[PDB]
Design a protein around this ligand. Structure first.
Ligand SMILES: COc1cc2c[nH+]c3c(c2cc1OC)Cc1cc2c(cc1-3)OCO2
Length: 565
DNA sequence: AAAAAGACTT
DNA sequence: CGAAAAATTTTT
DNA sequence: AAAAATTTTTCGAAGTCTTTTT
């Protein structure tokens, strides 16, 4: 089509659409039972299970490979939830989990998977084709004059929850989502989608102030899950753009706030002193303002405002630095945040005051929570909140570091390295860690062997040139002195090759325990990127793949080479 | 308020 | 997402 | 061709902030 929505006038705040029509959500493929020969054993005696329970048994049989299926919490929860999905001959016989034998089911599944990567184009293409009849019928919805794409219209299948980290609910069954759980949201003038035969949707609402197409209540933590639009849409873009534009507004008066909190580290009231120290951490250390959460329903992890006392430790002078805080805690997605950080004299003397006669299990910031912090932030700048501090620090660091890295002289894949090194700088700030792929890091030897090979191809292009400079001394004609210029051009064509290969070796190494994923799509103004690519002639696709190009299709078209965040 | 939902964001 | 799978692509 | 290191998809939750209810 080619729809420039960024040129259109905005929508009067709070009203999100006028028209919304979609063929609804796609359900999970119905459960296909086990064939006779894949028997299940309880107490060593052959037991055949009812479809409800057998379904729940496969979920466990498939995860057997994992170390977590031995964890107490996991076996406790799972089993409690399996008993429930069992009949009475079964709730009588199957007393504990530990006496059931899934090994046969488990092996059948490892077989089906290996005997899937073995079908030829005769059966393989027939699936990739049937899937395309689907993405077309259910994957696009019409929202106000335009056919826009839906994110993940395919509803999540029932399995067992595991979640990240030490989740208290790990093991609990994720119930299959029936149409009687689904609320559809469309316009009054839209052709309301038809439910699967023999079912009704939970509600057909026309709430035009929301951007969601379908919503149901999932049951592990009782949170409301949704089916929203593709990031390439208007309803997701206007928004993302607003967010970077709000990140830019914070820049105009960032120094002003960094002056007031610097002075607020004095204040007569203790409660203002907290709200200021917290603000420093979020600013200079890019911390998620930690909202509090229900104990026993989430993995114990925290952010800034929820920082318990046991999570921070003081040190006056360590490893040569003056006035340091030894940060150690589990942040979002249970990823660790270890950092020895040198603060200002006041702040250190201010943290001591916050820990003074307090128990390890208690809050560092008493009578402070994210609500209070955001209330202040909102007074400071219209529309401000605490994530903007991570978006700004992320963006302003990508742009300023591209200026400090990208050299005019350098070739095209070297710019990519200078860029990736800037991207990296954000990821270390934002604590966007990654764990090096499971024993797949011997592929550093099989990328370095390609280099200690290209060094030999070029070793000899020089040794071949050194013969031509001993032949251009005795006999200096049109077919000698010009045969050197084609043997030096050959050293050059292989230099620019070895260089690309070696630049792509340190871009892989420095990035072994760092994830640039999140910062690329979620933090970082894409215009900062487009500006740079238009400026140094690096073709856009060398930085952004297709879904990233699609999401960022508003920036690509808009920003000039001169754009400055 | 201030818990508890809901709706976005990462 | 980003680690894990499926679909590819290079290496052997 | 067949193993081997890839590049692309699929999968499986946890945050922030805002708006409601009790
Ligand atoms: C960092 O950025 C993103 C991080 C994510 C992390 N986890 C999940 C999603 C994400 C989407 C992001 O950006 C768009 C979508 C999602 C769906 C799920 C789920 C986990 C996640 O468990 C069941 O269904």
């Amino acid at each position: 089509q080619k729809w420039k929505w960024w040129e259109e006038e905005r929508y009067p705040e709070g009203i999100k659409w006028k028209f919304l029509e979609h063929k609804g959500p796609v359900f999970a493929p119905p459960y296909e039972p086990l064939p006779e020969n894949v028997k299940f054993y309880y107490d060593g005696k052959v037991m055949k299970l009812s479809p409800k329970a057998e379904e729940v048994a496969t979920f466990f049989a498939k995860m057997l490979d994992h170390e977590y299926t031995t964890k107490e919490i996991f076996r406790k929860n799972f089993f409690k939830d399996w008993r429930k999905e069992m009949t009475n001959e079964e709730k009588n016989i199957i007393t504990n989990l530990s006496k059931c034998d899934f090994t046969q089911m488990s092996q059948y599944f490892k077989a089906q998977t290996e005997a899937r990567k073995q079908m030829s184009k005769e059966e393989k293409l027939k699936i990739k084709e049937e899937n395309e009849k689907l993405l077309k019928e259910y994957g696009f919805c019409i929202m106000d004059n335009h056919k826009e794409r839906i994110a993940n219209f395919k509803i999540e299948p029932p399995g067992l929850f595991r979640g990240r980290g030490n989740h208290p609910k790990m093991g609990m069954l994720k119930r299959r989502i029936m149409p009687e759980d689904i609320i559809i949201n469309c316009s009054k003038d839209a052709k309301v989608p038809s439910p699967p035969p023999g079912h009704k949707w939970k509600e057909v609402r026309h709430d035009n102030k929301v951007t969601w197409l379908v919503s149901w209540t999932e049951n592990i933590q009782g949170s409301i899950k949704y089916i929203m639009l593709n990031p390439s849409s208007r309803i997701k873009g206007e928004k993302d753009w607003q967010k970077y534009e709000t990140a830019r507004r914070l820049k105009k008066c960032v120094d002003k706030i960094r002056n007031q909190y610097r002075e607020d580290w004095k204040s007569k009231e203790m409660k203002v002193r907290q709200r200021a120290v917290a603000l420093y951490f979020i600013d200079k250390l890019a911390l998620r303002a930690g909202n509090e959460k229900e104990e026993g329903e989430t993995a114990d992890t925290v952010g800034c405002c929820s920082l318990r006392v046991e999570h921070i430790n003081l040190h006056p002078e360590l490893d040569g630095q003056e006035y340091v805080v030894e940060f150690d805690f589990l942040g979002k997605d249970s990823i660790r945040y270890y950092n020895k950080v040198p603060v200002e004299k006041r702040v250190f003397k201010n943290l001591q005051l916050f820990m003074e006669n307090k128990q390890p299990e208690d809050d560092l910031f008493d009578r402070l929570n994210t609500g209070i912090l955001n209330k202040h932030l909102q007074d400071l700048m219209e529309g401000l909140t605490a994530k903007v501090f991570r978006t700004y620090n992320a963006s302003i660091t990508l742009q300023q570091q591209l200026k400090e890295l990208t050299a005019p002289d350098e070739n095209i894949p070297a710019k990519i390295l200078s860029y990736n090194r800037a991207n990296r700088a954000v990821a270390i700030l934002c604590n966007h860690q990654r764990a090096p792929p499971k024993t797949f890091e011997k592929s550093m030897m099989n990328l370095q062997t390609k280099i200690d090979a290209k060094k030999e191809q070029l070793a000899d292009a020089r040794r071949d040139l050194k013969s031509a400079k001993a032949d251009a001394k005795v006999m200096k004609d049109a077919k000698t002195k010009k045969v050197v210029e084609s043997k030096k051009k050959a050293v050059q064509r292989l230099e620019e090759q070895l260089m690309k290969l070696e630049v792509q070796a340190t871009d892989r190494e420095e990035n072994k325990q760092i994830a640039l994923g999140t910062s690329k799509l979620n933090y970082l103004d894409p215009r900062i990127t487009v500006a740079w690519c238009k400026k140094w002639g690096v073709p856009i696709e060398k930085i952004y793949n297709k879904t990233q190009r699609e999401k960022f299709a508003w920036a690509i078209d808009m920003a000039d080479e001169d754009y400055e965040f």
